């Protein structure tokens, strides 16, 4: 009960600290504020499972998420903002991606510099994109990290003498699938990989440990993403994808952040809003595939970028429906709390 | 008299009617609603041109406008939006344009699966750019539409195993015009052609029933739409694109649709205005080459963005000319009611 | 003393002059504002090192700046912001540019009416970006240019009969770098080479002349723009940018500009904010790298994208800092101006 939810009692407790207590606890919540989880203890299970995946991708995510914090308290913003991890939670993701989609194998030191550098743009994305956004009342979601790494991709590119990156090739032919071949085991086990790649981390182990890490933050948002990524396979399957990009979680951790996200943290959860968040999944997952062909005929991966757009998409349509409730961005704490201030709210 | 305008009186005496006759008069009306018309009897007419061009094509165009419109009263929409046919316009285009651009041929009844699926995703669109978009006084147009076909095309593709998409080929080499084989006859045809392409449809006889159900529903829209394809094909000519691209309508589509934007329906009608439309309608020509060429290198057609995209730059241009009036989108009917509501307000 | 700054006496005194004078003064300070410079004097030292590098690129840029103040005036467009040469001094590069990516080599007389045409629509971008803009208190920059110049190069392409333009290849093959060859006296020649690029014009001494009237209109703008430059030259060697490109300016055109608007300019005048130009201009050259490769799929180049985009997304980003000033865009003349403004509201 003491390490659930936000723990707001290691935050209170923490406020009189000396500094460097209240830095460790600020990267452990920006590294688990990637799913939406504001719990230093899921911090650490989410690094423990990178470490299980690649150690190498879990030192760059780990020092982007430093520099990040260390850059954006340089630049005098908000407090309160980076003790809840909200500054170095895209920088996380920006390390741990740049370490996935680099060409030059693990433990390239060199890449610690571009890393640093991006990580040093993650906070200004962060920002500018908040006063636009929160004048609308709608949060940023990966929007900061897709930018950066969209624009470091470009920037370098495959073919680039220091640092090239992974090639991205348009599909050419025509898929030919065994329909025969489909492995029920292995659609199962795609979810906690398609949980898990949310991080571009394929492991199993590894998507089971964060999906153990989201339960401990909250049982809601667990089941949410089980669900997402769930939806996701089955959005992979309609489409007649490929059987091994389905299996590698690519289709299931753009919908598993959608239904987290819809799902009781910036929606108060009802049934309706749990429907609301099914669909929201779907339409990600298919937006997903949608973007990942239209990137790939210029060199990108989508990454996030189907993900934030189709959950702001949802978040700004406005039903008159009084079961539909979008949460006020400064009560969003995580489905259990939500769902209490919204039952509050209605009487 | 009784057919022309809106027809305020049939919505007066549907208001109390049982809600089947209301649903086939919201059916009619989103169907009109694609050239700015609030006519179910256009909306017949335009229907019988579809037929006349394609069935099968004017099959999917209902079921997207029906399952558009049933989705959007599921949504708890705005229920005055719902009876205009503004919850289903969008889903006529999203269904016929994806009938029009399968591989797989006609009467491919599988492809009513995806097709009910983008219907099911045109009125949140549509709603999420409504809540954006009112706030400074602009309307969506066929946004949702241009969004769900990007997305679609883009998440199929042509080497879909379910569900291929017709190639899109950027210009590889320099055309070969002879320009002792242009024909002012099919210069002169391809105007109603252009105005049918709204649609998707190169039939010259859908077209001129197209124009037809328009100068029912206004007459000043319809010789704005003739005037737009007439302007879209002059640019075209300026260009020196190919004489098989003037002649299917592919030139004249989008500034048929501007002109009729621009001149009397959302500003009011003067011939400074009536300048302005014509302007509008060379830029949107231009613009949707352009953007035309810039899909292709995606695999994408442009479809009607580049109308969308040049009627919003203008709407939102600010000049300190009373003459040039923006009608507010509250008053907004067809351009013999503007132009009346602008002469009462000048005075 | 008469001719440094915006020369406000010149203005005051044209103010009863006929209007040809004052229209020639306009088409000056259009001229000039490409490197936010209200100067005439600037503007024809910038049309002098125009004919330096070319006289037809000159001729082309001079027409578009006339034919766009033409326009506004036409459109009734604000008068102040016609005099201080705002309308216009997008047409300058469009101008330019069309000149600069033509592939039918220099003295195409028929490329006088393409111009006219973009030099056109420039004010009304400028117009409709502006209305946009000025509810979040945002300059344009040369977001008008670069939206009429990549939506001509996409209508027109390499493979246009009338108006060819030059192929844009992307990078296919990694390149072969001699780090032995590098030249630190074409590294120093490139920083007025990269100030010239803003026009296009990669001659030294057209930069040179283009740094002289910057610097005459204001020491601290020229400044900026040499240490833009430079910034720019790092950046594309920390990337292992090919030789060629470096010593043809294309790395340090956008981070002058970038290093200009954040540096005194846009913002109050300190060394936190200088130092926040250095980094403004760092990742602009990294983003204008990023855009040409992004671009160059597409067959277009990115011209000023970057710039506008990072200068705008440094603006909107907001610090807790009382040093990190951004100054009302409605005293925004020049960085001493600037400055004095800023001190006496601190005090
Ligand atoms: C936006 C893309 C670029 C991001 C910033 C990249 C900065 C890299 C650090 C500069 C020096 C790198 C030297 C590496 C030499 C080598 O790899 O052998
Ligand atoms: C895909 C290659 C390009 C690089 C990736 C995108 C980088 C975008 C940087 C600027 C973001 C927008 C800033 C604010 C703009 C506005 O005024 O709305
Ligand atoms: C809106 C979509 C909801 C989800 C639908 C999931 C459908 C999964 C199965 C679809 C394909 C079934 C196999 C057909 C191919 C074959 O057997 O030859
Ligand atoms: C892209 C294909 C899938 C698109 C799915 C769009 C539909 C999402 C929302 C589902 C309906 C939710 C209705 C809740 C209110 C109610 O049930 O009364
Ligand atoms: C070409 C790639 C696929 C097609 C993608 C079309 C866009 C679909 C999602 C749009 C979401 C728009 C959200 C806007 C949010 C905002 O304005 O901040
Ligand atoms: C955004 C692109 C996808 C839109 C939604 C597509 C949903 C398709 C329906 C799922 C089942 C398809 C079965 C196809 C069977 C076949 O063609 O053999
Ligand atoms: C912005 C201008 C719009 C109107 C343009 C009208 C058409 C002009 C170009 C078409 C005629 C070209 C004739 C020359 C062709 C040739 O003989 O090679
Ligand atoms: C790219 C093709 C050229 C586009 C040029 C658009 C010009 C719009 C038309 C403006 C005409 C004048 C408007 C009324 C002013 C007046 O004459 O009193
Ligand atoms: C955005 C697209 C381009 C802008 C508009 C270009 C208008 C050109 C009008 C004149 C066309 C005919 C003159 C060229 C004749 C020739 O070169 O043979
Ligand atoms: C590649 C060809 C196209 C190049 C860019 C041309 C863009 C013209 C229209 C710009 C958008 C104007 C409307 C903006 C509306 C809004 O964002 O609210
Ligand atoms: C993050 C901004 C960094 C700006 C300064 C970067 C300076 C880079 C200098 C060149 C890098 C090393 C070049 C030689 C490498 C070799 O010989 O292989
Ligand atoms: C793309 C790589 C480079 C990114 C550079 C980002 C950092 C910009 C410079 C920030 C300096 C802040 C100075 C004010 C704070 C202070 O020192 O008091």
Known sequence: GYVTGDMKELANQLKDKPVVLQFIDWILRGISQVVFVNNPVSGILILVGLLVQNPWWALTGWLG???????????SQDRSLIASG?????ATLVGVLMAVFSDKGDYFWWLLLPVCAMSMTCPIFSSALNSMLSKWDLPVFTLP???????????????????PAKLVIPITTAPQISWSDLSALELLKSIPVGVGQIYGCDNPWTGGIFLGAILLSSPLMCLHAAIGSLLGIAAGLSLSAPFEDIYFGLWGFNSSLACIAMG??????????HLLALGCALFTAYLGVGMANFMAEVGLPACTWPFCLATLLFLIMTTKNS?????????????????????????
């Not at 998420?65 to 850059?71: D, E, F, H, K, Y």
């Not at 909200?86 to 895209?90: A, C, K, S, V």
């Not at 709390?337 to 039952?343: D, Q, S, T």
């Open 86 to 90: 909200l500054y170095g939670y895209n």
């Open 323 to 347: 079961n539909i409730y979008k949460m006020p961005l400064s009560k969003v704490t995580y489905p259990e709390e939500n769902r209490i201030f919204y039952l509050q709210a209605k009487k």
């Open 65 to 75: 998420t430093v520099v990040s914090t260390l850059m954006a308290l340089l630049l």
């Open 145 to 163: 990290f897709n930018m950066a790494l969209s624009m470091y991709l470009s920037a370098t590119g495959h073919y680039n003498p220091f640092f």
């Open 264 to 273: 009781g943290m910036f929606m108060a959860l009802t049934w309706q809003t």
